[PDB]
Design a binder for this molecule. Structure first.
Ligand SMILES: [Cl-]
Lengths: 102, 103, 104, 106, 105, 103
């Protein structure tokens, strides 16, 4: 169950990134992380090939944000279980309904 | 359309002006204000896609009147996937529903 | 309607002076102090629009005299839409209700 | 009851600024405020003439801090009552023993 | 003595890759994620010192595969003083207990 | 007088090294870790003034050998005024009482 991530500079772009990712494939948006200096990341979980398609769409679609900018992106095909318990990449009760349709 | 419209400014006074202009210019509801550090704050409206287009364009014009204001980014999402409302601050909150209840 | 006026400064001492000068210059209530990171802070006052206009002028002039003070932006909205009060920190709160009455 | 403030870049300078202020005159250190970009402010209250002396000393001492630096300072002699309900400059319970020791001039 | 290894990146996707490479490269425990503002975030692993050296070596190497990745700083303390845990966010916690049990020594 | 020693660094790994080298160098207690944003983080030790002087000097040297650490500022106050502890994060807590006893 891969994890996919798009970090942008600026909030409107991260919202476009989120929207494009879940529309382009069967992935679940599981969170949004702010780390300062305007850098915010959206995080999806799903089958790796779905996640790869999501992230590509997300990256492409930030291009249509006026002032949007992608700072970094990464996919991990098979994240180690320890990561879920420390980093905010885990599903929450709030998004359980979407994890279903994957 | 249940579009979402967003304007991100540098500076708080400009963002208050962007929100005030957007809700005056069309039938949209201001639902959120997000800070992501570094002086960047975004206000978020929801409504019909053509109303949101008008709001965002008005917000951008009106921030021009602000002494020291600046728009950093804007965007409209025409049909926000239902997953977004659960993770990102783009939904009506109880406070805004109080406002809407006055009608 | 009740106008809203705001002065945003780079530095906390300057924002305290801005607030102090605003409430002393005219009949306005200080209702908000907003921090958005990176040293940028804003004080927000509410009152009749002409009082708010006098206050904000006073605030900007007194910041200029703070050792290290700097105003980054200022703005006045004569008739803020009612939706704003439910989302942005511009509203009167119970803690400043006493000063609201002093306005009139 | 005046309010005196020194904003520094960096936290060790702000602690020195606080220490020099309360040692130089009978005022009370009531708080410290962080607003991002490494800017932190310490805040004292007291009689205006005592606060003047505290702030002068805090500014002198911060110059001895390895790497520290004052960014801004300011004293408001007779802060309006409204300020206290919105800005973080209030006395708190925790410092009332020092408030009692302030020297006032009538 | 249980070493502590740290990799600080500018940006969240790189920190997540650093963490993943660290726990895959050796038998250590990822115990924390610290944000200090300005984009700087750190991940912290604990375990035997030769394992922590391999984890930290691998996290640093894997951050290069992150598009837009940057490592800002890295450090390993072989035998961290006992005071450190009670003040700094480097402690083991219940949430990662299952992974501490799997550590190599 | 229980003196107070501080080292502020750029970056979390360097602050952990600063802390570590300080409590290893002399008889002081690590009581505090303060973040003020912009990557600036400060660690705070308490102890006898001559013990604090040695801790701070060691912490500065060891920080400079960290990969990417910088010492942004340091300072030592020999006899901090009583008022400081009720306002700033420099006091002992229960959590490190065990190490105070050891000075
Ligand atoms: Cl209230």
């Amino acid at each position: 169950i891969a994890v996919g991530m798009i970090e942008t500079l600026g909030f409107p772009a991260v919202v476009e990134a989120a929207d494009a990712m879940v529309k382009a494939a069967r992935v679940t948006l599981v969170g949004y992380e702010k780390i300062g200096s305007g850098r915010v990341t959206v995080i999806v979980r799903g089958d790796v090939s779905e996640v790869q398609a999501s992230v590509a769409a997300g990256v492409e679609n930030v291009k249509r944000v006026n002032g949007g900018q992608v700072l970094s992106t990464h996919i991990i095909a098979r994240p180690h279980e320890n990561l879920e318990y420390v980093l905010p990449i885990r599903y929450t009760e709030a998004v359980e309904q979407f994890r279903e349709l994957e």
